[PDB]
Design a protein around this motif. Structure first.
Motif, PDB file in Angstrom:
ATOM      1  N   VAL I 284       0.833  -1.191   0.000  1.00 43.27           N
ATOM      2  CA  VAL I 284       0.000   0.000   0.000  1.00 43.27           C
ATOM      3  C   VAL I 284       0.869   1.243   0.000  1.00 43.27           C
ATOM      4  CG1 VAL I 284      -1.694   1.350   1.274  1.00 43.27           C
ATOM      5  CG2 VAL I 284      -1.907  -1.138   1.166  1.00 43.27           C
TER       6      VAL I 284
ATOM      7  N   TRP J  62     -14.609  -6.576   9.059  1.00 43.92           N
ATOM      8  CA  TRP J  62     -14.167  -5.762   7.935  1.00 43.92           C
ATOM      9  C   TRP J  62     -14.661  -4.331   8.053  1.00 43.92           C
ATOM     10  CZ3 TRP J  62     -17.104  -3.300   4.199  1.00 43.92           C
ATOM     11  CH2 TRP J  62     -18.469  -3.604   4.182  1.00 43.92           C
ATOM     12  N   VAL J  66     -12.325  -0.796   8.335  1.00 40.46           N
ATOM     13  CA  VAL J  66     -12.412   0.333   7.422  1.00 40.46           C
ATOM     14  C   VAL J  66     -12.787   1.593   8.178  1.00 40.46           C
ATOM     15  CG1 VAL J  66     -13.493   1.263   5.358  1.00 40.46           C
ATOM     16  CG2 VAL J  66     -13.130  -1.201   5.571  1.00 40.46           C
TER      17      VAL J  66
HETATM   18  C1  LIG Z   1      -2.147   5.990   5.464  1.00 39.04           C
HETATM   19  C2  LIG Z   1      -2.788   4.701   5.047  1.00 39.04           C
HETATM   20  O1  LIG Z   1      -2.226   3.631   5.212  1.00 39.04           O
HETATM   21  O2  LIG Z   1      -4.120   4.745   4.447  1.00 39.04           O
HETATM   22  C3  LIG Z   1      -4.417   3.712   3.503  1.00 39.04           C
HETATM   23  C4  LIG Z   1      -5.190   2.621   4.222  1.00 39.04           C
HETATM   24  C5  LIG Z   1      -5.630   1.498   3.293  1.00 39.04           C
HETATM   25  C6  LIG Z   1      -6.527   0.545   4.068  1.00 39.04           C
HETATM   26  C7  LIG Z   1      -4.453   0.701   2.774  1.00 39.04           C
HETATM   27  C8  LIG Z   1      -6.357   2.063   2.110  1.00 39.04           C
HETATM   28  C9  LIG Z   1      -6.905   1.306   1.275  1.00 39.04           C
HETATM   29  C10 LIG Z   1      -7.574   0.574   0.506  1.00 39.04           C
HETATM   30  C11 LIG Z   1      -8.953   0.360   0.994  1.00 39.04           C
HETATM   31  C12 LIG Z   1     -10.155   0.666   0.153  1.00 39.04           C
HETATM   32  C13 LIG Z   1      -9.099  -0.096   2.245  1.00 39.04           C
HETATM   33  C14 LIG Z   1     -10.385  -0.317   2.884  1.00 39.04           C
HETATM   34  C15 LIG Z   1     -10.788  -1.501   3.337  1.00 39.04           C
HETATM   35  C16 LIG Z   1     -10.041  -2.765   3.199  1.00 39.04           C
HETATM   36  C17 LIG Z   1      -9.035  -3.223   4.227  1.00 39.04           C
HETATM   37  C18 LIG Z   1     -10.348  -3.487   2.110  1.00 39.04           C
HETATM   38  C19 LIG Z   1     -11.361  -2.948   1.193  1.00 39.04           C
HETATM   39  C20 LIG Z   1     -12.588  -3.472   1.087  1.00 39.04           C
HETATM   40  C21 LIG Z   1     -13.007  -4.645   1.851  1.00 39.04           C
HETATM   41  C22 LIG Z   1     -14.226  -5.152   1.654  1.00 39.04           C
HETATM   42  C23 LIG Z   1     -15.131  -4.480   0.679  1.00 39.04           C
HETATM   43  C24 LIG Z   1     -14.699  -6.329   2.395  1.00 39.04           C
HETATM   44  C25 LIG Z   1     -14.839  -7.537   1.862  1.00 39.04           C
HETATM   45  C26 LIG Z   1     -15.333  -8.539   2.793  1.00 39.04           C
HETATM   46  C27 LIG Z   1     -16.389  -9.314   2.542  1.00 39.04           C
HETATM   47  C28 LIG Z   1     -17.151  -9.201   1.266  1.00 39.04           C
HETATM   48  C29 LIG Z   1     -16.808 -10.225   3.587  1.00 39.04           C
HETATM   49  O3  LIG Z   1     -16.987  -9.698   4.644  1.00 39.04           O
HETATM   50  C30 LIG Z   1     -17.038 -11.706   3.474  1.00 39.04           C
HETATM   51  C31 LIG Z   1     -17.870 -12.165   4.675  1.00 39.04           C
HETATM   52  O4  LIG Z   1     -19.159 -11.577   4.621  1.00 39.04           O
HETATM   53  C32 LIG Z   1     -19.122 -12.970   4.338  1.00 39.04           C
HETATM   54  C33 LIG Z   1     -19.724 -13.208   2.962  1.00 39.04           C
HETATM   55  C34 LIG Z   1     -19.825 -13.745   5.454  1.00 39.04           C
HETATM   56  C35 LIG Z   1     -19.266 -13.400   6.821  1.00 39.04           C
HETATM   57  O5  LIG Z   1     -19.757 -14.246   7.855  1.00 39.04           O
HETATM   58  C36 LIG Z   1     -17.770 -13.528   6.731  1.00 39.04           C
HETATM   59  C37 LIG Z   1     -17.390 -12.207   6.123  1.00 39.04           C
HETATM   60  C38 LIG Z   1     -18.093 -11.136   6.947  1.00 39.04           C
HETATM   61  C39 LIG Z   1     -15.896 -12.011   6.235  1.00 39.04           C
HETATM   62  C40 LIG Z   1      -6.492   3.540   1.936  1.00 39.04           C
HETATM   63  C41 LIG Z   1      -7.726   4.017   2.687  1.00 39.04           C
HETATM   64  O6  LIG Z   1      -6.736   3.761   0.548  1.00 39.04           O
HETATM   65  C42 LIG Z   1      -5.237   4.305   2.358  1.00 39.04           C
END
Ligand SMILES: CC(=O)O[C@H]1CC(C)(C)C(=C=C/C(C)=C/C=C\C(C)=C/C=C\C=C(C)\C=C\C=C(/C)C(=O)C[C@@]23O[C@]2(C)C[C@@H](O)CC3(C)C)[C@](C)(O)C1
Ligand code: CLA
Ligand code: CLA
Ligand code: CLA
Ligand code: CLA
Ligand code: CLA
Ligand code: CLA
Ligand code: CLA
Ligand SMILES: CC(=O)O[C@H]1CC(C)(C)C(=C=C/C(C)=C/C=C/C(C)=C/C=C/C=C(C)/C=C\C=C(/C)C(=O)C[C@@]23O[C@]2(C)C[C@@H](O)CC3(C)C)[C@](C)(O)C1
Ligand SMILES: CC1=C(/C=C/C(C)=C/C=C/C(C)=C/C=C/C=C(C)/C=C/C=C(C)/C=C/C2=C(C)CCCC2(C)C)C(C)(C)CCC1
Ligand SMILES: CC1=C(C/C=C(\C)CCC[C@H](C)CCC[C@H](C)CCCC(C)C)C(=O)c2ccccc2C1=O
Ligand code: SF4
Ligand code: SF4
Lengths: 33, 40, 80, 29, 62, 74, 74, 160, 732, 89
Positions: I284, J62, J66
């Motif tokens: 990242v 998750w 976020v």
């Molecule tokens: C200074 C600094 O470092 O800032 C950085 C931080 C960081 C984090 C690197 C950045 C980045 C990128 C992003 C967009 C980060 C945000 C979020 C992140 C970390 C990733 C994205 C999405 C995750 C999703 C959509 C989840 C999928 C998850 C899903 C679809 C699920 O929950 C599956 C599941 O549900 C089932 C189907 C059943 C449940 O029983 C079991 C679970 C619940 C598990 C930034 C913000 O850009 C800048």
């Protein structure tokens, strides 16, 4: 046999090689291109 | 006298006298108040 | 061999030219000082790098500066 | 157990490195 | 102003007496490069107590 | 001269010469004694002859015996 | 080197005790002959071994020597 | 206790040390006899030893496993005698010396020969100046707020 | 030029032996070579780096090869705690029959035991057979060759990179952070999950079955479904025997905390999770700079905008961007500094949080590794400051950095130097004073009058992480603390066990003795820093020599005038600081060794009581533990420690020989050499042979360097023998 | 370019987008972001402190992960709002 290699290479690496290398350096530094 | 006093006023002489006095008073304190690692 | 440079702060005291062990410095006519003389280094090929000249300069900062450099038989003081 | 052939293969590889080393040295010169 | 017996502060960075006060002894008027002759009360690393400076290198202190 | 004088004096007032003279083999030579300040007294060893002091190694006792001193008044 | 030679030679081939009968026990035991022929010998059979006294002088009348030994190194 | 230490009054090791120390001296005294000057000295020494241990025992000093006193200096006032209180003493005395020294140097700086008075001190003046250091804390602060202590970039500096 | 120093006419036209000496030591200062353009400089440096990389890989290849061909890895694998690891065999024609037997003890041929820790590392990472090690060596030999080809290729006319390519900071940083560090970590967790962890549990996964042996029973289903918790279920039992399936688990990514009960090392599953997390962070972070895709940050703008509004830091960081990009010396200094800190951290954290199996039980290896990295760290630190000074003398532009954060540093140089001096004095006087007080009182037989301060602050920190001995009920040491509640169901259970186990090096117990040694180490760092910092700041000029910048980084002196100007160059600061660096590192290493030695021996009390005064260190450490070493060879025989014994004495010789160069200066020697010349020219028969390079004495700076090297080599060698022979001779 | 002098930085330093946003909007966003981050922390705290049931790291969610990233964003946004206010926009 590979086992004989220690007794065939060490004499060369520690005696023949260093000598020739030193000789070459001397000839190189004592030459006036 | 005046000249001798000047000699006695020289740096080396004064240091020795002062340090002897300082050393003495420290020694004397330990003689009467000995073995202290804290204010009691 | 070595490089000796004289600066405008010279006062023509002649002390430097009187200290060189190998006659590298001379006193030449000049108008920038009251004495009307400045030092020159015509024969730097004989400088041994002693820096006696610098030790003799009376100016705040040396008006004569010796920068050691390439070494030759003469500069290395080799009689052999 | 490293066989003789295996040891000999290693030595051959080393030789290649040596010849390629001389060139790099001579190219940097 | 730079003048005999005036007190000035040296402004030559290479001087041992930079940012220090000295007394102007005499100022030559013959066009020499460094006319003013200032005297200091402290010897330099060489043991001298005087040097000649230009008027710009000296600022009057009073 | 002052140095030599001091040594003889210290051998007259701060020594075990008399005892050593009687039994040279056992008693140990000593001619310096430390004041009892700050545990420095430990430096006063049990040399012998009902005396406690620093064991000297300059050889004064032997010389004096050869000269025939015998007493501490001398 | 000279003073060290004297110290080891004497403590090894001269000084010591002799019994009423002819039994001579030198202080170090005659180690000079086969130990002083190598540098390791001097470091081990002389400096390391004969220094056991100064290093273990604390708490005794010889404590001063220990302190001075350290002070001198400093 | 602090750091798992134990008060010396309640430390067995501390007591063992005491007994052992006294025993050593006593064993030595046995060789000498009666009022022999050597014996009397050793006897007096044991008294001092006993006193020292007693003083430490009555104190608030904390001993460790070795039975040796360990000092505490984290700022707690419970053990202020160990560092804080003695510390004030050093600061007061040290400041006194420094203040008086600076005063004398500055005072003789304006004399006929400012360098002769540094190798041959003017004792009368020095004594006067030395006595005036007992109030150094007050004087120093007053000089600071009067812009008379710290100088202002009118001092020599390096070429760069 | 037409002589040896082709890169220098000045040296080439020299009629003396200096030509040869200097040419060798000025060979890698490519920036000062005759006719050097910036483009060529960068290109040659790039190629040289390829060569260095190749050497490193060849070195690694050799270790694998020799261990595989002449070692006992497989036997060690079978009985790790009862076998001594072998490095390489010995074939010395000078050995006597006795020596052949002594060094052949435990084996059938003369051999050297390794104290590098390779066996434990390889065992942990998955290696189990000699054939595997062989493959690795062969592969690295091939990679080395490839690197050599690259060096030649990029020096060819059509492949030489442009100067612009060498100065594209954004792309390099993005790539290096995201790919070199980030993706590499992801690859490593892959290896750990696929090969290492299976091996620990008794399963063999190699190139033969890796594509058909799923790392986890569930598969990659949980990963993509989002049910990541599955990969942390069923962690290995506390009764698991390493390298076998008894008590094994199925977990691949976990946060158990602590050490495996049997191997006394960190859990492999945790390490895998560690690298996975680090991977994401770096990947990242590698998307921060603009690289021909529109998005991103421009470093120059970031630096320029950062100026505190108050004006306390002047103009801020404006101008630094150009200074760094146009100065290789500053870049090197920054790098060496960071690597130096890293090396020290590796040493400190590796002995507490043991990473490899059965490494804690190998005392000698553990000791060697610490001393090894700490010494390397010192050299790396000193070099950073050295190149920092070279920067000021050669690449600093006073005008560009006007009122910059860097320039203002050189404005209050006196303040910095003076205050660092005071700190050094304070630490020095009191530390030494307290030690001497303790020595005197103890000597007089009154140990109860020692001034011993408890390290309360450190003890508090240990307690804060869970230690309970100190009885400070704080943070993790408190059951009611909010912190304890947070991790009580996460990683604390395992951690609180290890931290409170007396048989581990996790936060070793500290006492009054540790207080003093720590303050001594502080003195060392401060004084070493003073020398180095002063050298850097006073490198462009001083009151004695206001024109130092025009003479360079290293010059002999400025003459016997103005009071005497010996050792006035900046290079001399490095020269002087080296000695202090060695001293401080020595103190640090001595402390670690003695403390551990007493712990291993079962008598922790000896250090606790004798470390308070100096005599203790000399008698209970140096004198007592030197007995095995000095008896490697005696008038009665010899043992395998003979080589170590001999080296110990050898070190003393080199060290002392160094003194000759340091105390004796050139004048005396030059005159003596002159007499020798006369003799050769006047002695018949020998007159036939004559020199072609006039014999002259070594230069002022040269002698300083030669002396420092002799001093340093002897210093390291002597301690190396002691730390190894003493530990091995007693506990091995 | 980005070099600035005075008591407040120019809007150009806030990037290519926020440099055009109003001060109030940024403030609203800042407060909201901080709220989300704090909420996430408090809620996660309960999960970590609930008896059992968090084995295998079930406490990591998750959404909360976020949300927790709002905290750093909150800092940036609040600083930016100040800059915009001083700049007049
Ligand atoms: C200074 C600094 O470092 O800032 C950085 C931080 C960081 C984090 C690197 C950045 C980045 C990128 C992003 C967009 C980060 C945000 C979020 C992140 C970390 C990733 C994205 C999405 C995750 C999703 C959509 C989840 C999928 C998850 C899903 C679809 C699920 O929950 C599956 C599941 O549900 C089932 C189907 C059943 C449940 O029983 C079991 C679970 C619940 C598990 C930034 C913000 O850009 C800048
Ligand atoms: C890895 C390097 C190496 C090797 C293989 C040897 C090997 C040997 N050394 Mg040795 N040595 C070395 C480095 C080495 N040394 C170094 C660096 C030093 C300096 C400290 C010494 C100092 C040294 C001394 C002082 C002595 C030896 C001796 C010996 C021999 C004792 C065994 C024997 O049977 O002697 C019996 C000798 C023989 C059976 C004769 C063997 C046939 C000879 C060696 C043929 C040499 C021809 C050779 C190709 C010429 C070189 C040409 C040039 C271009 C390189 C043995 C051949 C001893 C000896 O006897 O020397 C010969 C001896 O006195 N060495
Ligand atoms: C080589 C000469 C020498 C040396 C080294 C010593 C050494 C010693 N003597 Mg000794 N002594 C000597 C000669 C010497 N003596 C002679 C010649 C005599 C006969 C008079 C004596 C008579 C004598 C007695 C009677 C005693 C000693 C004692 C001692 C011990 C304590 C010394 C002392 O007073 O400390 C303390 C020092 C002082 C009290 C002096 C104060 C320090 C002065 C003020 C500093 C000098 C001021 C300075 C010079 C100013 C300069 C002014 C300018 C005009 C020069 C010490 C081991 C004492 C002892 O062992 O008791 C157990 C003791 O009682 N000595
Ligand atoms: C960075 C280290 C550090 C520093 C600078 C201080 C500084 C201080 N501590 Mg302290 N302390 C520390 C670490 C530190 N502590 C640690 C780690 C502990 C736990 C062992 C303590 C436990 C502690 C106690 C129990 C007390 C102090 C007190 C004090 C203050 C002394 C009283 C005064 O007026 O002066 C002083 C501000 C005292 C205080 O606040 O007095 C009002 C006090 O009673 N400290
Ligand atoms: C993804 C693509 C990629 C990759 C993998 C690399 C890889 C590499 N490049 Mg590179 N490069 C790239 C793209 C890439 N480059 C691009 C696009 C450019 C043009 C802009 C360049 C321009 C370039 C130049 C000009 C040079 C390199 C060099 C190098 C090599 C560095 C030496 C080495 O092996 O160290 C690898 C070392 C490691 C993997 C170990 C890392 C250890 C650190 C300390 C880990 C730290 C972890 C953590 C932070 C510590 C925590 C504790 C801390 C807080 C103290 C390395 C092989 C150099 C070289 O040697 O060339 C031959 C060189 O001079 N590159
Ligand atoms: C990546 C690391 C790195 C790099 C690339 C450089 C690169 C450079 N450094 Mg640098 N340096 C480094 C690390 C590094 N250094 C470290 C860690 C230190 C601290 C010690 C220094 C300290 C340092 C100084 C003090 C100087 C340099 C200089 C230089 C430049 C010329 C080097 C030279 O002339 O060597 C040419 C080749 C040699 C000197 C051969 C080295 C032979 C060594 C000294 C002896 C080997 C040990 C011995 C033989 C072992 C035998 C023992 C056996 C008996 C058991 C060059 C740009 C010099 C310069 O002026 O740059 C402007 C300079 O004055 N560096
Ligand atoms: C045992 C050897 C030794 C010792 C003790 C020292 C001591 C010192 N060196 Mg040093 N040095 C040494 C070897 C040594 N060096 C070698 C071999 C080199 C070659 C590389 C150097 C190179 C070197 C450099 C390049 C520098 C030093 C500096 C210093 C000082 C650091 C500040 C300090 O510790 O203040 C405390 C000093 C001491 C404790 C030592 C003197 C102690 C005496 C006995 C006074 C004790 C007083 C006592 C506490 C009681 C006082 C009260 C009493 C009067 C009643 C200090 C004086 C630095 C400096 O100048 O300081 C700012 C510095 O820049 N050294
Ligand atoms: C993808 C593979 C993977 C797997 C199976 C795990 C497994 C685990 N991680 Mg982990 N982690 C990983 C990658 C992985 N990690 C990476 C790449 C990072 C860097 C960002 C982290 C950062 C990380 C932290 C910071 C923490 C964990 C924690 C945990 C544990 C409980 C959470 C959990 O199972 O996921 C639950 C996650 C989800 C159900 C979906 C998350 C999707 C994201 C938000 C996108 C468990 C041992 C927690 C723990 O127990 O340690 C105390 C914890 O605090 N991990
Ligand atoms: C007019 C109008 O419309 O409004 C007006 C009126 C009104 C409302 C009064 C006004 C206002 C608004 C104000 C004052 C707004 C905000 C002030 C504010 C917001 C000030 C600091 C936030 C600092 C933070 C978040 C610091 C650190 C966040 C940190 C340090 C984090 O580490 C987050 C963390 O994430 C990590 C990286 C890891 C995570 O996993 C978990 C944690 C949590 C540890 C104004 C300005 O007058 C405008
Ligand atoms: C000469 C010079 C140079 C160099 C410099 C240097 C060499 C520096 C160094 C520096 C250094 C060497 C630094 C260090 C630092 C450190 C730090 C900065 C640390 C910090 C810490 C922190 C921040 C915290 C941490 C923590 C955490 C995280 C949590 C809690 C606990 C604690 C403690 C742990 C150069 C080249 C640039 C150029 C210019 C001049
Ligand atoms: C001993 C000594 C010398 C003389 C030392 C010399 C001349 C070393 C000579 C021996 C070395 C090992 C060089 C010998 C090299 C061989 C002749 C082989 C050379 C082959 C070439 C091709 C390199 C100095 O010149 C000197 C200068 C300044 C301060 C102290 C000293 C000092 O102490
Ligand atoms: S350095 Fe010596 S030889 Fe050269 S000009 Fe000065 S005095 Fe003359
Ligand atoms: S190096 Fe030589 S010329 Fe320079 S100050 Fe020292 S003694 Fe004088």
């Amino acid at each position: 046999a590979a086992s004989f290699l220690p007794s065939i290479l060490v004499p060369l690496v520690g005696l023949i090689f260093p000598a020739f290398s030193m000789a070459l350096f001397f000839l190189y530094v004592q030459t006036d291109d | 006298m005046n000249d001798f006093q000047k000699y006695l006023s020289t740096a080396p002489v004064l240091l020795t006298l002062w340090m002897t006095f300082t050393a003495g008073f420290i020694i004397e304190v330990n003689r009467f108040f000995p073995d202290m690692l804290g204010l009691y | 061999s070595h490089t000796v440079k004289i600066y405008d702060t010279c006062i023509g005291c002649t002390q430097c030219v009187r200290a060189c062990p190998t006659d590298v410095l001379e006193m030449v006519p000049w108008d920038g000082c009251k004495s009307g003389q400045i030092a020159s280094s015509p024969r730097v090929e004989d400088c041994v790098g002693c820096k006696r000249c610098e030790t003799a300069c009376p100016t705040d900062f040396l008006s004569v500066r010796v920068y050691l450099g390439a070494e030759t038989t003469r500069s290395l003081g080799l009689a052999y | 157990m490293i066989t003789d052939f295996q040891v000999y293969i290693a030595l051959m590889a080393a030789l290649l490195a040596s010849v390629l080393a001389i060139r790099l040295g001579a190219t940097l010169y | 102003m730079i003048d005999r017996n005036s007190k000035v502060r040296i402004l030559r960075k290479e001087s041992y007496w930079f940012n220090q006060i000295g007394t102007v002894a005499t100022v030559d008027q013959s066009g020499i490069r460094y006319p003013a002759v200032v005297r200091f009360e402290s010897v330099n690393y060489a043991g001298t107590n005087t040097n000649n400076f230009a008027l710009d290198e000296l600022v009057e202190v009073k | 001269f002052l140095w030599i004088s001091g040594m003889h004096f210290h051998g007259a007032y701060f020594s075990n010469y008399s005892a050593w003279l009687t039994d040279p083999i056992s008693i140990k030579q000593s001619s310096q004694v430390v004041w009892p300040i700050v545990g420095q007294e430990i430096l006063n060893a049990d040399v012998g002859g009902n005396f406690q002091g620093i064991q000297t190694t300059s050889g004064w006792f032997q010389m004096w015996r050869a000269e025939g001193i015998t007493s501490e008044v001398e | 080197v000279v003073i060290f030679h004297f110290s080891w030679k004497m403590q090894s081939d001269v000084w010591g005790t002799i019994t009423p009968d002819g039994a001579i026990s030198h202080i170090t035991g005659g180690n000079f002959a086969q130990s002083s022929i190598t540098i390791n010998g001097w470091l081990r059979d002389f400096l390391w071994s004969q220094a056991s006294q100064v290093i273990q002088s604390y708490g005794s009348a010889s404590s001063a020597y220990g302190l001075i030994f350290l002070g001198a190194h400093f | 206790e602090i750091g798992g230490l134990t008060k010396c009054s309640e430390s067995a090791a501390f007591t063992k040390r005491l007994n052992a120390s006294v025993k050593k001296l006593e064993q030595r005294a046995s060789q000498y006899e009666a009022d022999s000057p050597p014996a009397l000295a050793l006897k007096q020494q044991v008294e001092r030893t006993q006193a020292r241990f007693d003083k430490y025992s009555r104190s608030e000093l904390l001993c460790g496993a070795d039975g040796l006193p360990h000092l505490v200096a984290d700022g707690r006032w419970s053990h202020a005698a160990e560092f804080i209180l003695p510390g004030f003493g050093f600061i007061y005395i040290s400041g006194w010396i420094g203040w008086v020294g600076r005063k004398y140097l500055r005072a003789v700086s304006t004399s006929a020969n400012p360098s002769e008075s540094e190798i041959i001190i003017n004792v009368p003046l020095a004594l006067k100046i030395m006595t005036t250091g007992y109030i150094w804390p007050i004087s120093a602060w007053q000089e600071l707020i009067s812009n008379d202590l710290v100088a202002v970039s009118e001092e020599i500096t390096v070429s760069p | 030029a037409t002589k040896f120093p082709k890169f220098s006419q000045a040296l080439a036209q020299d009629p003396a032996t200096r030509r040869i000496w200097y040419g060798i030591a000025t060979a890698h200062d490519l920036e000062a070579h005759d006719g050097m353009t910036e483009e060529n400089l960068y290109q040659k440096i790039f190629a040289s780096h390829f060569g260095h990389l190749a050497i490193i890989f060849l070195w690694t290849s050799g270790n694998l090869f020799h261990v595989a061909w002449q070692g006992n890895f497989e036997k060690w694998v079978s009985n790790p705690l009862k076998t001594r690891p072998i490095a390489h065999s010995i074939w010395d024609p000078h050995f006597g029959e006795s020596a052949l037997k002594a060094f052949s003890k435990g084996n059938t041929y003369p051999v050297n035991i390794t104290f590098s820790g390779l066996y434990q590392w390889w065992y942990t990472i998955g290696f189990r057979t000699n054939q595997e090690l062989y493959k690795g060596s062969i592969g690295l030999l091939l990679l080395a060759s490839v690197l050599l080809i690259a060096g030649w290729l990029h020096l060819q006319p059509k492949f030489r990179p442009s100067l612009s390519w060498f100065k594209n900071n954004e792309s390099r940083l993005n790539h290096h952070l995201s790919g070199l560090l980030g993706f590499s970590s992801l690859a490593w967790t892959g290896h750990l999950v696929h090969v290492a962890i299976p091996a620990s549990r008794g399963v063999h996964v190699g190139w033969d079955n890796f594509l058909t042996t799923p790392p986890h029973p569930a598969g990659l289903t949980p990963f993509f479904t989002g049910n990541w918790t599955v990969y942390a279920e069923n962690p290995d039992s506390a009764t698991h025997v390493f390298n076998t399936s008894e008590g094994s688990g199925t977990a691949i990514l976990t946060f158990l905390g602590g050490f495996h009960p049997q191997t006394q090392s960190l859990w492999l599953s945790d390490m895998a999770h560690h690298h996975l997390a680090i991977a994401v962070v770096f990947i990242v972070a590698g998307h921060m700079y603009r690289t021909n895709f529109g998005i991103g940050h421009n470093m120059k703008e970031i630096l320029d905008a950062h100026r505190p509004p108050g004006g306390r830091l002047g103009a801020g960081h404006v101008g630094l961007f150009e200074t760094i990009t146009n100065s290789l010396h500053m870049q090197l200094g920054l790098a060496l500094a960071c690597l130096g800190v890293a090396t020290s951290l590796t040493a400190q954290h590796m002995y507490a949080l043991t990473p490899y199996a059965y490494l804690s039980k190998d005392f000698t290896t553990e000791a060697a590794l610490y001393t090894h990295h700490q010494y390397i760290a010192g050299f790396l630190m000193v070099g950073a400051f050295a190149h920092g000074a070279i920067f000021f003398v050669r690449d600093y532009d006073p005008e560009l950095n006007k009122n910059n954060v860097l320039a203002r540093m050189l404005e209050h140089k006196e303040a910095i130097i003076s205050h660092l001096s005071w700190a050094s004095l304070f630490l020095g006087f009191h530390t030494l004073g307290l030690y001497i007080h303790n020595d005197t009182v103890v000597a007089f037989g009154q140990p109860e009058k020692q001034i011993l301060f408890e390290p309360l602050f450190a003890e508090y920190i240990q307690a804060a992480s869970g230690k309970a001995v100190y009885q400070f009920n704080v943070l993790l040491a408190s059951s009611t603390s909010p912190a304890t509640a947070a991790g009580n169901q996460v990683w604390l259970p395992g951690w609180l066990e290890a931290i409170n186990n007396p048989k581990t090096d996790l936060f070793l117990k500290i006492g009054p003795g540790d207080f003093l040694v720590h303050h001594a180490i502080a003195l060392g760092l401060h004084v070493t820093a003073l020398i180095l910092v002063k050298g850097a700041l006073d490198a462009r000029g001083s009151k004695l020599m206001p024109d130092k910048k025009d003479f360079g980084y290293s010059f002999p002196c400025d003459g016997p005038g103005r009071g005497g100007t010996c050792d006035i160059s900046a290079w001399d600061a490095f020269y002087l600081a080296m000695f202090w660096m060695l001293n401080t590192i020595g103190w640090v290493t001595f402390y670690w060794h003695w403390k551990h030695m007493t712990i291993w021996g079962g008598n922790p009390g000896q250090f606790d009581e004798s470390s308070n005064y100096i005599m203790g260190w000399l008698r209970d450490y140096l004198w007592l533990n030197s007995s095995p070493l000095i008896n490697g060879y005696n008038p009665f025989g010899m043992n395998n420690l003979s080589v170590w014994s001999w080296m110990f004495l050898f070190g003393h010789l080199i060290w002392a020989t160094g003194f000759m160069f340091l105390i004796s200066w050139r004048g005396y020697w030059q005159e003596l050499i002159e007499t020798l010349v006369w003799a050769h020219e006047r002695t018949p028969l020998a007159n036939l042979i004559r020199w072609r390079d006039k014999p002259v004495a070594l230069s002022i700076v040269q002698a300083r360097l030669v002396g420092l090297v002799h001093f340093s080599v002897g210093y390291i060698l002597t301690y190396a023998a002691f730390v190894i022979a003493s530990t091995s001779g007693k506990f091995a | 370019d980005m070099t600035w002098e005075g008591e407040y930085p120019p809007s150009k330093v806030l990037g290519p987008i926020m440099s055009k946003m109003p001060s109030g909007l940024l403030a609203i966003i800042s407060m909201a972001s901080l709220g989300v981050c704090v909420y996430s922390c408090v809620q996660t705290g309960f999960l970590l402190r609930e008896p059992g049931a968090i084995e295998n790291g079930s406490w990591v969610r998750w959404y909360y992960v976020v949300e927790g990233l709002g905290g750093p964003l909150a800092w940036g946004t609040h600083v930016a709002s100040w800059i915009q206010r001083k700049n007049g926009m």
